[PDB]
PDB file of C-alpha atoms and ligand atoms in Angstrom:
ATOM      1  CA  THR A 299      -1.453  10.568   6.489  1.00  0.00           C
ATOM      2  CA  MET A 300      -0.952   7.035   6.010  1.00  0.00           C
ATOM      3  CA  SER A 301      -2.880   7.938   2.663  1.00  0.00           C
ATOM      4  CA  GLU A 302      -0.384  10.349   1.598  1.00  0.00           C
ATOM      5  CA  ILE A 303       2.201   7.553   1.904  1.00  0.00           C
ATOM      6  CA  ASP A 304       0.189   5.288  -0.332  1.00  0.00           C
ATOM      7  CA  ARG A 305      -0.439   7.583  -2.969  1.00  0.00           C
ATOM      8  CA  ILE A 306       3.404   8.023  -3.086  1.00  0.00           C
ATOM      9  CA  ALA A 307       4.139   4.517  -2.966  1.00  0.00           C
ATOM     10  CA  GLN A 308       2.120   3.253  -6.065  1.00  0.00           C
ATOM     11  CA  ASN A 309       3.358   6.268  -8.064  1.00  0.00           C
ATOM     12  CA  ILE A 310       6.431   5.369  -7.425  1.00  0.00           C
ATOM     13  CA  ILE A 311       6.253   1.838  -7.856  1.00  0.00           C
ATOM     14  CA  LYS A 312       4.102   2.195 -11.125  1.00  0.00           C
ATOM     15  CA  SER A 313       6.960   4.440 -12.215  1.00  0.00           C
ATOM     16  CA  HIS A 314       9.191   1.716 -11.739  1.00  0.00           C
ATOM     17  CA  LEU A 315       7.667  -0.876 -13.527  1.00  0.00           C
ATOM     18  CA  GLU A 316       6.926   1.093 -16.692  1.00  0.00           C
ATOM     19  CA  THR A 317      10.650   2.257 -16.663  1.00  0.00           C
ATOM     20  CA  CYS A 318      12.901  -0.497 -16.703  1.00  0.00           C
ATOM     21  CA  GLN A 319      14.223  -2.171 -19.835  1.00  0.00           C
ATOM     22  CA  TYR A 320      13.443  -5.144 -19.193  1.00  0.00           C
ATOM     23  CA  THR A 321      10.403  -6.335 -17.015  1.00  0.00           C
ATOM     24  CA  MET A 322      10.791  -9.054 -14.027  1.00  0.00           C
ATOM     25  CA  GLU A 323       9.439 -11.479 -16.173  1.00  0.00           C
ATOM     26  CA  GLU A 324      11.683 -10.588 -19.696  1.00  0.00           C
ATOM     27  CA  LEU A 325      14.888 -11.085 -17.292  1.00  0.00           C
ATOM     28  CA  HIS A 326      13.314 -14.993 -15.612  1.00  0.00           C
ATOM     29  CA  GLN A 327      14.043 -15.886 -19.505  1.00  0.00           C
ATOM     30  CA  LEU A 328      16.892 -14.227 -19.705  1.00  0.00           C
ATOM     31  CA  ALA A 329      18.877 -15.211 -16.618  1.00  0.00           C
ATOM     32  CA  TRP A 330      19.331 -18.765 -18.349  1.00  0.00           C
ATOM     33  CA  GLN A 331      21.043 -17.220 -21.020  1.00  0.00           C
ATOM     34  CA  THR A 332      24.381 -17.016 -21.097  1.00  0.00           C
ATOM     35  CA  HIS A 333      27.039 -15.882 -23.370  1.00  0.00           C
ATOM     36  CA  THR A 334      29.367 -18.588 -24.555  1.00  0.00           C
ATOM     37  CA  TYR A 335      33.280 -19.267 -24.472  1.00  0.00           C
ATOM     38  CA  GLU A 336      33.764 -18.191 -27.535  1.00  0.00           C
ATOM     39  CA  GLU A 337      31.659 -14.922 -26.781  1.00  0.00           C
ATOM     40  CA  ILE A 338      33.735 -14.114 -23.722  1.00  0.00           C
ATOM     41  CA  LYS A 339      36.705 -14.357 -25.414  1.00  0.00           C
ATOM     42  CA  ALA A 340      35.753 -11.877 -28.014  1.00  0.00           C
ATOM     43  CA  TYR A 341      35.053  -9.621 -25.126  1.00  0.00           C
ATOM     44  CA  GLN A 342      38.272 -10.482 -23.908  1.00  0.00           C
ATOM     45  CA  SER A 343      39.766  -9.133 -27.197  1.00  0.00           C
ATOM     46  CA  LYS A 344      38.254  -6.032 -27.310  1.00  0.00           C
ATOM     47  CA  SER A 345      40.535  -3.182 -27.148  1.00  0.00           C
ATOM     48  CA  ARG A 346      40.066  -0.897 -23.929  1.00  0.00           C
ATOM     49  CA  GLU A 347      38.692   1.674 -25.854  1.00  0.00           C
ATOM     50  CA  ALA A 348      36.475  -0.509 -28.012  1.00  0.00           C
ATOM     51  CA  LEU A 349      34.642  -1.941 -24.468  1.00  0.00           C
ATOM     52  CA  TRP A 350      34.712   1.118 -22.557  1.00  0.00           C
ATOM     53  CA  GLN A 351      32.389   2.487 -25.568  1.00  0.00           C
ATOM     54  CA  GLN A 352      30.430  -0.425 -25.435  1.00  0.00           C
ATOM     55  CA  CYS A 353      29.948  -0.146 -21.723  1.00  0.00           C
ATOM     56  CA  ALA A 354      29.372   3.488 -21.968  1.00  0.00           C
ATOM     57  CA  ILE A 355      26.874   3.156 -24.282  1.00  0.00           C
ATOM     58  CA  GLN A 356      24.793   0.381 -21.813  1.00  0.00           C
ATOM     59  CA  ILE A 357      25.337   2.847 -19.311  1.00  0.00           C
ATOM     60  CA  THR A 358      23.862   5.753 -21.307  1.00  0.00           C
ATOM     61  CA  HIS A 359      21.189   3.437 -22.121  1.00  0.00           C
ATOM     62  CA  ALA A 360      20.242   2.257 -18.493  1.00  0.00           C
ATOM     63  CA  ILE A 361      20.337   5.993 -17.502  1.00  0.00           C
ATOM     64  CA  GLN A 362      17.901   6.874 -19.636  1.00  0.00           C
ATOM     65  CA  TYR A 363      15.564   4.668 -18.288  1.00  0.00           C
ATOM     66  CA  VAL A 364      16.302   6.490 -15.181  1.00  0.00           C
ATOM     67  CA  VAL A 365      15.458   9.738 -16.302  1.00  0.00           C
ATOM     68  CA  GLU A 366      12.285   8.580 -17.272  1.00  0.00           C
ATOM     69  CA  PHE A 367      11.674   7.184 -13.976  1.00  0.00           C
ATOM     70  CA  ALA A 368      12.173  10.277 -12.134  1.00  0.00           C
ATOM     71  CA  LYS A 369       9.638  11.951 -14.704  1.00  0.00           C
ATOM     72  CA  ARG A 370       6.631  10.030 -13.698  1.00  0.00           C
ATOM     73  CA  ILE A 371       7.414  10.497  -9.709  1.00  0.00           C
ATOM     74  CA  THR A 372       5.025  13.394  -8.866  1.00  0.00           C
ATOM     75  CA  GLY A 373       6.705  14.080  -5.778  1.00  0.00           C
ATOM     76  CA  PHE A 374      10.016  14.687  -8.038  1.00  0.00           C
ATOM     77  CA  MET A 375       8.680  16.856 -10.825  1.00  0.00           C
ATOM     78  CA  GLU A 376       7.369  19.158  -8.313  1.00  0.00           C
ATOM     79  CA  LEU A 377      11.008  20.041  -6.978  1.00  0.00           C
ATOM     80  CA  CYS A 378      12.285  22.929  -9.171  1.00  0.00           C
ATOM     81  CA  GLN A 379      14.236  21.924 -12.259  1.00  0.00           C
ATOM     82  CA  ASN A 380      17.446  23.232 -10.896  1.00  0.00           C
ATOM     83  CA  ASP A 381      17.200  20.108  -8.101  1.00  0.00           C
ATOM     84  CA  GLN A 382      15.924  17.712 -10.348  1.00  0.00           C
ATOM     85  CA  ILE A 383      18.851  18.033 -12.288  1.00  0.00           C
ATOM     86  CA  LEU A 384      21.196  18.138  -9.768  1.00  0.00           C
ATOM     87  CA  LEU A 385      19.542  14.520  -8.082  1.00  0.00           C
ATOM     88  CA  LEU A 386      19.572  13.218 -11.510  1.00  0.00           C
ATOM     89  CA  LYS A 387      23.566  14.312 -12.273  1.00  0.00           C
ATOM     90  CA  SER A 388      24.216  13.205  -9.022  1.00  0.00           C
ATOM     91  CA  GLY A 389      22.172   9.705  -8.845  1.00  0.00           C
ATOM     92  CA  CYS A 390      21.217   8.324 -12.059  1.00  0.00           C
ATOM     93  CA  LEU A 391      24.296   5.938 -11.916  1.00  0.00           C
ATOM     94  CA  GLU A 392      23.324   4.617  -8.556  1.00  0.00           C
ATOM     95  CA  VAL A 393      19.893   4.040  -9.231  1.00  0.00           C
ATOM     96  CA  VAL A 394      21.878   2.075 -12.481  1.00  0.00           C
ATOM     97  CA  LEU A 395      23.450   0.475 -10.142  1.00  0.00           C
ATOM     98  CA  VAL A 396      20.870  -0.378  -7.436  1.00  0.00           C
ATOM     99  CA  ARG A 397      18.590  -1.564 -10.912  1.00  0.00           C
ATOM    100  CA  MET A 398      21.585  -3.938 -12.007  1.00  0.00           C
ATOM    101  CA  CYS A 399      21.069  -6.173  -9.057  1.00  0.00           C
ATOM    102  CA  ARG A 400      17.820  -6.670 -10.994  1.00  0.00           C
ATOM    103  CA  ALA A 401      19.872  -8.872 -13.667  1.00  0.00           C
ATOM    104  CA  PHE A 402      22.032 -10.329 -11.925  1.00  0.00           C
ATOM    105  CA  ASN A 403      22.504 -13.877 -11.123  1.00  0.00           C
ATOM    106  CA  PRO A 404      23.911 -14.597  -7.432  1.00  0.00           C
ATOM    107  CA  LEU A 405      24.310 -18.266  -8.211  1.00  0.00           C
ATOM    108  CA  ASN A 406      27.076 -18.165 -10.472  1.00  0.00           C
ATOM    109  CA  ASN A 407      28.048 -14.108 -10.067  1.00  0.00           C
ATOM    110  CA  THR A 408      27.118 -13.216 -13.640  1.00  0.00           C
ATOM    111  CA  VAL A 409      25.042 -10.314 -14.895  1.00  0.00           C
ATOM    112  CA  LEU A 410      23.016  -9.532 -18.088  1.00  0.00           C
ATOM    113  CA  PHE A 411      25.251  -7.811 -20.655  1.00  0.00           C
ATOM    114  CA  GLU A 412      24.471  -6.936 -24.045  1.00  0.00           C
ATOM    115  CA  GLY A 413      21.680  -9.578 -24.058  1.00  0.00           C
ATOM    116  CA  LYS A 414      22.828 -12.635 -22.080  1.00  0.00           C
ATOM    117  CA  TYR A 415      24.542 -13.323 -18.713  1.00  0.00           C
ATOM    118  CA  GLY A 416      28.250 -13.095 -18.266  1.00  0.00           C
ATOM    119  CA  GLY A 417      30.666 -13.219 -15.461  1.00  0.00           C
ATOM    120  CA  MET A 418      33.053 -10.376 -14.181  1.00  0.00           C
ATOM    121  CA  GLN A 419      36.001 -11.669 -16.609  1.00  0.00           C
ATOM    122  CA  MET A 420      33.933 -10.354 -19.410  1.00  0.00           C
ATOM    123  CA  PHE A 421      34.771  -7.109 -18.545  1.00  0.00           C
ATOM    124  CA  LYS A 422      38.881  -7.801 -18.518  1.00  0.00           C
ATOM    125  CA  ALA A 423      39.626  -5.422 -21.440  1.00  0.00           C
ATOM    126  CA  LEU A 424      38.019  -2.444 -19.152  1.00  0.00           C
ATOM    127  CA  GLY A 425      41.366  -2.942 -17.310  1.00  0.00           C
ATOM    128  CA  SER A 426      39.785  -1.781 -14.128  1.00  0.00           C
ATOM    129  CA  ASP A 427      38.507  -5.053 -12.073  1.00  0.00           C
ATOM    130  CA  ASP A 428      38.749  -3.554  -8.794  1.00  0.00           C
ATOM    131  CA  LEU A 429      35.367  -1.506  -9.956  1.00  0.00           C
ATOM    132  CA  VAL A 430      33.991  -4.648 -11.632  1.00  0.00           C
ATOM    133  CA  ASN A 431      34.868  -6.255  -8.577  1.00  0.00           C
ATOM    134  CA  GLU A 432      33.350  -3.930  -6.315  1.00  0.00           C
ATOM    135  CA  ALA A 433      29.897  -3.114  -8.905  1.00  0.00           C
ATOM    136  CA  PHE A 434      29.637  -7.049  -8.631  1.00  0.00           C
ATOM    137  CA  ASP A 435      29.977  -7.138  -4.601  1.00  0.00           C
ATOM    138  CA  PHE A 436      27.547  -4.847  -4.317  1.00  0.00           C
ATOM    139  CA  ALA A 437      25.043  -6.621  -6.731  1.00  0.00           C
ATOM    140  CA  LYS A 438      25.181  -9.918  -4.765  1.00  0.00           C
ATOM    141  CA  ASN A 439      25.303  -8.588  -1.425  1.00  0.00           C
ATOM    142  CA  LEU A 440      21.858  -6.713  -2.505  1.00  0.00           C
ATOM    143  CA  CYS A 441      20.320  -9.569  -4.174  1.00  0.00           C
ATOM    144  CA  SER A 442      21.037 -11.771  -0.663  1.00  0.00           C
ATOM    145  CA  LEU A 443      17.851  -9.450   0.821  1.00  0.00           C
ATOM    146  CA  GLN A 444      15.555 -11.081  -2.029  1.00  0.00           C
ATOM    147  CA  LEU A 445      13.976  -7.627  -2.421  1.00  0.00           C
ATOM    148  CA  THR A 446      10.777  -7.551  -4.336  1.00  0.00           C
ATOM    149  CA  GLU A 447      10.171  -5.156  -7.345  1.00  0.00           C
ATOM    150  CA  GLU A 448       8.214  -2.421  -5.120  1.00  0.00           C
ATOM    151  CA  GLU A 449      11.212  -2.510  -2.733  1.00  0.00           C
ATOM    152  CA  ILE A 450      13.545  -2.195  -5.222  1.00  0.00           C
ATOM    153  CA  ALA A 451      11.456   0.734  -6.530  1.00  0.00           C
ATOM    154  CA  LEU A 452      10.670   2.515  -3.521  1.00  0.00           C
ATOM    155  CA  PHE A 453      14.990   2.268  -2.574  1.00  0.00           C
ATOM    156  CA  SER A 454      15.666   3.100  -5.894  1.00  0.00           C
ATOM    157  CA  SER A 455      13.395   6.424  -5.482  1.00  0.00           C
ATOM    158  CA  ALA A 456      15.172   6.946  -1.861  1.00  0.00           C
ATOM    159  CA  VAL A 457      18.589   6.582  -3.669  1.00  0.00           C
ATOM    160  CA  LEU A 458      17.871   9.298  -6.191  1.00  0.00           C
ATOM    161  CA  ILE A 459      15.417  11.888  -3.833  1.00  0.00           C
ATOM    162  CA  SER A 460      18.487  12.321  -1.496  1.00  0.00           C
ATOM    163  CA  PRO A 461      18.218  15.973   0.121  1.00  0.00           C
ATOM    164  CA  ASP A 462      22.018  15.122   0.881  1.00  0.00           C
ATOM    165  CA  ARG A 463      23.464  15.798  -2.884  1.00  0.00           C
ATOM    166  CA  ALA A 464      25.681  19.309  -2.635  1.00  0.00           C
ATOM    167  CA  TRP A 465      24.366  22.183  -4.429  1.00  0.00           C
ATOM    168  CA  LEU A 466      20.611  21.503  -3.714  1.00  0.00           C
ATOM    169  CA  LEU A 467      18.977  24.630  -3.784  1.00  0.00           C
ATOM    170  CA  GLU A 468      15.884  23.197  -1.433  1.00  0.00           C
ATOM    171  CA  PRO A 469      16.969  19.933   0.117  1.00  0.00           C
ATOM    172  CA  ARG A 470      14.359  20.392   2.767  1.00  0.00           C
ATOM    173  CA  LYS A 471      11.926  19.360   0.330  1.00  0.00           C
ATOM    174  CA  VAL A 472      13.664  16.668  -1.081  1.00  0.00           C
ATOM    175  CA  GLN A 473      14.102  15.502   2.369  1.00  0.00           C
ATOM    176  CA  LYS A 474      10.421  15.752   2.922  1.00  0.00           C
ATOM    177  CA  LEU A 475       9.612  12.941   0.102  1.00  0.00           C
ATOM    178  CA  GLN A 476      12.485  10.783   1.023  1.00  0.00           C
ATOM    179  CA  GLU A 477      10.976  10.663   4.687  1.00  0.00           C
ATOM    180  CA  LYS A 478       7.372   9.809   3.469  1.00  0.00           C
ATOM    181  CA  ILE A 479       9.431   7.097   0.448  1.00  0.00           C
ATOM    182  CA  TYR A 480      11.540   5.422   3.375  1.00  0.00           C
ATOM    183  CA  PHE A 481       8.038   5.308   5.472  1.00  0.00           C
ATOM    184  CA  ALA A 482       6.449   3.668   2.462  1.00  0.00           C
ATOM    185  CA  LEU A 483       9.483   1.391   2.033  1.00  0.00           C
ATOM    186  CA  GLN A 484       9.229   0.183   5.725  1.00  0.00           C
ATOM    187  CA  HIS A 485       5.759  -0.854   5.616  1.00  0.00           C
ATOM    188  CA  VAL A 486       5.862  -2.918   2.205  1.00  0.00           C
ATOM    189  CA  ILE A 487       9.012  -4.508   3.642  1.00  0.00           C
ATOM    190  CA  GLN A 488       6.696  -6.106   6.363  1.00  0.00           C
ATOM    191  CA  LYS A 489       4.349  -7.536   3.795  1.00  0.00           C
ATOM    192  CA  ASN A 490       7.144  -9.882   3.019  1.00  0.00           C
ATOM    193  CA  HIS A 491      10.627 -10.246   5.048  1.00  0.00           C
ATOM    194  CA  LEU A 492       9.941 -11.190   8.114  1.00  0.00           C
ATOM    195  CA  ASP A 493      11.977  -9.979  11.056  1.00  0.00           C
ATOM    196  CA  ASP A 494      14.357  -8.016   9.118  1.00  0.00           C
ATOM    197  CA  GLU A 495      17.116  -5.035   9.743  1.00  0.00           C
ATOM    198  CA  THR A 496      16.112  -5.001   5.799  1.00  0.00           C
ATOM    199  CA  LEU A 497      15.546  -1.441   6.055  1.00  0.00           C
ATOM    200  CA  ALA A 498      18.793  -0.809   8.135  1.00  0.00           C
ATOM    201  CA  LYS A 499      20.215  -2.473   5.928  1.00  0.00           C
ATOM    202  CA  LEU A 500      19.303  -1.169   2.949  1.00  0.00           C
ATOM    203  CA  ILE A 501      20.064   2.133   4.387  1.00  0.00           C
ATOM    204  CA  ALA A 502      23.758   1.275   5.267  1.00  0.00           C
ATOM    205  CA  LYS A 503      24.399   0.695   1.994  1.00  0.00           C
ATOM    206  CA  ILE A 504      23.765   4.360   0.541  1.00  0.00           C
ATOM    207  CA  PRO A 505      27.590   5.089   1.129  1.00  0.00           C
ATOM    208  CA  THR A 506      28.966   1.790  -0.932  1.00  0.00           C
ATOM    209  CA  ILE A 507      26.563   2.916  -3.397  1.00  0.00           C
ATOM    210  CA  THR A 508      28.174   6.060  -3.767  1.00  0.00           C
ATOM    211  CA  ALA A 509      31.724   4.653  -3.495  1.00  0.00           C
ATOM    212  CA  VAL A 510      30.833   2.398  -6.475  1.00  0.00           C
ATOM    213  CA  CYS A 511      29.598   5.196  -8.591  1.00  0.00           C
ATOM    214  CA  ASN A 512      32.609   7.570  -7.497  1.00  0.00           C
ATOM    215  CA  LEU A 513      35.164   5.309  -8.338  1.00  0.00           C
ATOM    216  CA  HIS A 514      33.618   4.502 -11.774  1.00  0.00           C
ATOM    217  CA  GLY A 515      34.052   8.314 -12.246  1.00  0.00           C
ATOM    218  CA  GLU A 516      37.786   7.919 -11.175  1.00  0.00           C
ATOM    219  CA  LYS A 517      38.282   5.279 -13.412  1.00  0.00           C
ATOM    220  CA  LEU A 518      36.597   7.202 -16.537  1.00  0.00           C
ATOM    221  CA  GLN A 519      39.205  10.036 -15.521  1.00  0.00           C
ATOM    222  CA  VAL A 520      42.083   8.151 -15.824  1.00  0.00           C
ATOM    223  CA  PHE A 521      40.750   6.947 -19.729  1.00  0.00           C
ATOM    224  CA  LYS A 522      39.786  10.230 -20.655  1.00  0.00           C
ATOM    225  CA  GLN A 523      43.614  11.183 -20.100  1.00  0.00           C
ATOM    226  CA  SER A 524      44.672   8.163 -22.179  1.00  0.00           C
ATOM    227  CA  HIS A 525      41.773   8.564 -25.106  1.00  0.00           C
ATOM    228  CA  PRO A 526      40.339  12.135 -24.926  1.00  0.00           C
ATOM    229  CA  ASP A 527      38.997  11.628 -28.600  1.00  0.00           C
ATOM    230  CA  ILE A 528      37.343   8.501 -27.899  1.00  0.00           C
ATOM    231  CA  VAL A 529      35.441  10.348 -25.090  1.00  0.00           C
ATOM    232  CA  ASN A 530      34.899  13.659 -26.749  1.00  0.00           C
ATOM    233  CA  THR A 531      33.564  11.930 -30.397  1.00  0.00           C
ATOM    234  CA  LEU A 532      32.460   8.711 -29.675  1.00  0.00           C
ATOM    235  CA  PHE A 533      30.968   8.386 -26.033  1.00  0.00           C
ATOM    236  CA  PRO A 534      26.936   8.917 -25.865  1.00  0.00           C
ATOM    237  CA  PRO A 535      27.106  13.051 -25.666  1.00  0.00           C
ATOM    238  CA  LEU A 536      25.090  12.202 -22.169  1.00  0.00           C
ATOM    239  CA  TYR A 537      27.480  10.235 -20.649  1.00  0.00           C
ATOM    240  CA  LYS A 538      30.054  12.954 -21.432  1.00  0.00           C
ATOM    241  CA  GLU A 539      27.688  15.931 -19.912  1.00  0.00           C
ATOM    242  CA  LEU A 540      27.407  13.538 -16.940  1.00  0.00           C
ATOM    243  CA  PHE A 541      30.708  12.339 -16.075  1.00  0.00           C
ATOM    244  CA  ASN A 542      33.253  14.279 -18.088  1.00  0.00           C
TER     245      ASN A 542
ATOM    246  CA  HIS B  19      23.167  20.259 -18.936  1.00  0.00           C
ATOM    247  CA  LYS B  20      21.535  20.465 -22.161  1.00  0.00           C
ATOM    248  CA  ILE B  21      20.616  17.253 -22.843  1.00  0.00           C
ATOM    249  CA  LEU B  22      19.734  15.887 -19.795  1.00  0.00           C
ATOM    250  CA  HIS B  23      17.438  19.423 -19.610  1.00  0.00           C
ATOM    251  CA  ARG B  24      15.821  18.633 -22.895  1.00  0.00           C
ATOM    252  CA  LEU B  25      15.356  14.895 -21.632  1.00  0.00           C
ATOM    253  CA  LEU B  26      13.355  16.342 -18.736  1.00  0.00           C
ATOM    254  CA  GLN B  27      11.251  18.601 -21.032  1.00  0.00           C
ATOM    255  CA  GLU B  28      10.330  15.754 -23.487  1.00  0.00           C
TER     256      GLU B  28
HETATM  257  C1  STE C 618      25.792  -0.139 -12.701  1.00  0.00           C
HETATM  258  C2  STE C 618      26.372   0.998 -13.192  1.00  0.00           C
HETATM  259  C3  STE C 618      27.694   1.483 -12.192  1.00  0.00           C
HETATM  260  C4  STE C 618      28.399   1.120 -12.748  1.00  0.00           C
HETATM  261  C5  STE C 618      29.849  -0.125 -12.639  1.00  0.00           C
HETATM  262  C6  STE C 618      31.174   0.002 -13.731  1.00  0.00           C
HETATM  263  C7  STE C 618      31.316  -1.010 -14.276  1.00  0.00           C
HETATM  264  C8  STE C 618      31.244  -2.366 -14.071  1.00  0.00           C
HETATM  265  C9  STE C 618      30.974  -3.309 -14.965  1.00  0.00           C
HETATM  266  C10 STE C 618      30.059  -2.982 -16.466  1.00  0.00           C
HETATM  267  C11 STE C 618      28.815  -3.043 -16.011  1.00  0.00           C
HETATM  268  C12 STE C 618      27.816  -3.385 -17.172  1.00  0.00           C
HETATM  269  C13 STE C 618      27.765  -2.111 -17.550  1.00  0.00           C
HETATM  270  C14 STE C 618      26.519  -0.966 -16.266  1.00  0.00           C
HETATM  271  C15 STE C 618      24.813  -1.416 -16.617  1.00  0.00           C
HETATM  272  C16 STE C 618      24.527  -2.313 -15.672  1.00  0.00           C
HETATM  273  C17 STE C 618      22.900  -2.415 -15.941  1.00  0.00           C
HETATM  274  C18 STE C 618      21.935  -2.169 -17.137  1.00  0.00           C
HETATM  275  O1  STE C 618      22.407  -2.374 -18.152  1.00  0.00           O
HETATM  276  O2  STE C 618      20.679  -1.338 -16.607  1.00  0.00           O
END
């Protein structure tokens, strides 16, 4: 039913618009703001634990918005709470990663972090350039598709609503919704992207998204080895709950 | 997942 597809699309699109930290408008006005040479140096002078703490707070902040996003998607709240938790636990960061492309500037390869745009050197203190570079490469490639907010809303919902996550109790139910979401995304893409490969190029990115987030987990596990007290008593409790 | 559970229940 095309009518059901449209109701699902409007619901997700609306949830996205009401659950982003920065509306698309606020971002156009922030993209011109860039951290100065001094500010970049300050970030680089941070201890690895200090910057990790800052990044964990920002990621958690973004993750909390993804929870609000999920809670407003009617089809998601219809799943058993167990699968809701599983989907969020396994995909919150993946959604955040997709959403990051909204606040990324491919012209100079900079991203919004703590109020202004900064390059990858801004994260030098993390001691994880491989992770930063993979995150930036992903954002750059996604940005090249020139997606609209509706498409980012729908695609991000498909990344979250994955029937493939391990341990799901009702994967078919999740599968049925994801199918409808993709059907919606496919129609919405036509309003913009003439010709395309768009939907196919987006779906082909699913594994890369997960790869980046797994790398984040990997770096964090080693971070925990070196600084257990920081993770257990300074990192946001939700961040610890989700990734450690 | 106490925290995540709480946020969903809000
Ligand atoms: C985007 C989340 C995936 C994890 C990325 C690994 C670290 C990459 C460098 C740090 C980027 C800034 C913190 C992540 C938050 C990005 C977007 C946001 O603030 O909503």
